[PDB]
């Protein structure tokens, strides 16, 4: 996974993982988000990079890159980058149990 700090950082991390998918996580579901974001990032990175690989996650901390990716797409914020370009955007805040269901769905092409 790529950790990002900008919509520019989000997009860079997506472009740098062109073969698979780079998911930019902009902000999180509150509630002491930073430490929780890093902890989820570690489990998602093993599910993202190790287990499914398919996907590296880059926890946007904290700007509006998600909104920028959505604006670019025309198609918490989750912006999926393929070869650095937004291809799939979803918004909402989810708990860890919800994330496990998302891992089963992964990995998208």
């Amino acid at each position: 996974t790529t950790t990002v700090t900008s919509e520019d950082h989000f997009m860079t991390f997506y472009n740098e993982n062109n073969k698979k998918l780079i998911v930019v996580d902009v902000y999180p579901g509150w509630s002491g988000p930073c430490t929780a974001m890093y902890p989820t990032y570690n489990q998602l990175m093993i599910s993202i990079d190790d287990f499914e690989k398919r996907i590296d996650i880059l926890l946007l901390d904290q700007d509006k890159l998600v909104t920028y990716k959505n604006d670019k797409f025309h198609a918490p914020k989750f912006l999926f980058i393929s070869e650095g370009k937004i291809i799939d955007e979803v918004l909402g805040t989810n708990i860890p149990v919800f994330i496990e269901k998302v891992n089963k769905y992964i990995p998208l092409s």
């Binding site: 073969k19 599910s47 190790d50 287990f51 990995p107 092409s109």
Partner: protein, 397 residues
């Protein structure tokens, strides 16, 4: 539709006359009211709405004539025999004239109606004498283009028959090369699918990336074959079939890519299991084993269809699940050192029930499927013995 547009335009002309009549003279209702200025404003807006329907093809006619004129210009070039090259460029126009001739004739009837429909509900003449002159001019060039196209087509057919023999000889060579490339692409995706991480990492991911590059090269070659078939044209069924064969190879490549992604997810789970063995902890192992077994079962159910040889990799998942299950039996704290030792003697494992943090990795070597049975017998014996031992604790105390 064009007919709907004509009906709407006639209705609009009727509406204009009705609106002009509908203003009426100054009406007196205690204070005199004049709609004279208001009536002019309504007429202005009514004309603009009427103008859009009337000017619909006003801009379009010039654009169609501008586009139509270019086709005639190609026809004016003509020339028989001479250079083969020119034939490849000119030959496409005939393929375009046929499609345009059929579709254009169908499109011609509504266009004729549209000019006529406006004339009925528009008293004013558009472009004066030029619009009627324009229709006559288009008809004379269209007829000239048709005669030119027939002569061009007879010449085109003889030269194209020679071109057609050349096209099949070249096509057979290209088809053999394409079949070899397709076999290589099928082998590249299959090799990545055949390779199993569990354990192996990075190289398998690199192989998948290399396979995608090979697929991209095949797609470029496939695009070239389709373009050559389009240039050849002649409504050849075989050319369409060749494109379909390339599409089937692409679908197989897509299935291989999906299989590679599934293998990576399985590898991540395997990596987590290796980390758990170093971490060890009987309480932690029991919770981890139950979670691992559920995730492995879900992954096996999700996998379906794709390509052959999936079952050979799929079986591995079953082995991993068995290994996870064998580990769960050890998670029992009922077994003591003597109990573990008896089991250890049968097992032959140097590691004891609680030997190290890194003991979980040691447990993996004894296969779970191969050794849950003997582990279980012991796990049971131990659990049985403590029920008594615990009884004695009561009598004792």
């Amino acid at each position: 539709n064009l007919d709907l547009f004509d009906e709407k335009i006639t209705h609009l002309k009727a509406i204009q006359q009705e609106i002009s009549r509908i203003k009426t003279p100054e009406d007196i209702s205690w204070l005199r009211i004049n709609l004279q200025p208001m009536k002019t404003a309504l007429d202005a807006r009514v004309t603009r709405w009427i103008r859009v329907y009337t000017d619909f093809l006003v801009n379009q006619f010039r654009t169609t004539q501008k586009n139509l004129l270019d086709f005639i210009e190609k026809t004016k070039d003509g020339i028989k025999k001479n250079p083969a090259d020119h034939e490849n460029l000119h030959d496409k126009k005939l393929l375009m004239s046929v499609m345009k001739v059929i579709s254009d004739v169908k499109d011609v009837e509504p266009r004729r109606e549209g000019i006529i429909t406006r004339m009925k509900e528009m008293v004013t003449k558009l472009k004066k004498h030029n619009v009627p002159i324009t229709e006559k001019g288009t008809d004379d060039p269209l007829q000239q283009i048709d005669n030119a196209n027939s002569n061009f087509i007879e010449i085109y057919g003889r030269v194209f028959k020679v071109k057609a023999d050349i096209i099949p000889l070249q096509a057979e060579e290209t088809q053999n090369i394409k079949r070899d490339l397709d076999i290589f692409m099928k082998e590249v995706e299959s090799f990545r699918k055949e390779f199993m991480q569990k354990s192996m990492g990075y190289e398998n991911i690199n192989n998948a990336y290399d396979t995608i590059m090979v697929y991209y090269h095949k797609l470029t070659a496939i695009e070239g074959r389709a373009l050559e078939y389009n240039n050849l044209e002649k409504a050849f069924e075989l050319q369409k079939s060749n494109y379909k064969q390339l599409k089937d190879c692409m679908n197989d490549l897509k299935n291989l890519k999906t299989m590679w992604d599934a293998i990576a997810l399985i590898h991540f789970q395997y990596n987590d299991w290796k980390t758990k063995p170093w971490r060890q902890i009987k309480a932690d192992i029991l919770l981890d084993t139950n979670k691992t077994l559920g995730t492995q079962i879900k992954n096996l159910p999700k996998e379906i269809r794709n390509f052959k040889g999936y079952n050979v990799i799929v079986e591995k998942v079953k082995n991993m699940g068995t290994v996870l299950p064998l580990v769960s039996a050890l998670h029992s704290e009922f077994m003591e050192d003597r109990h573990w030792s008896q089991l250890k003697q049968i097992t032959g494992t140097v590691f004891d029930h609680n030997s190290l943090s890194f003991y979980f990795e040691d447990i993996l070597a004894l296969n779970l499927y191969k050794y849950e049975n003997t582990v279980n017998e012991i796990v049971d014996v131990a659990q049985k013995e403590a029920k008594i031992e615990k009884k004695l604790k009561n009598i004792e105390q």
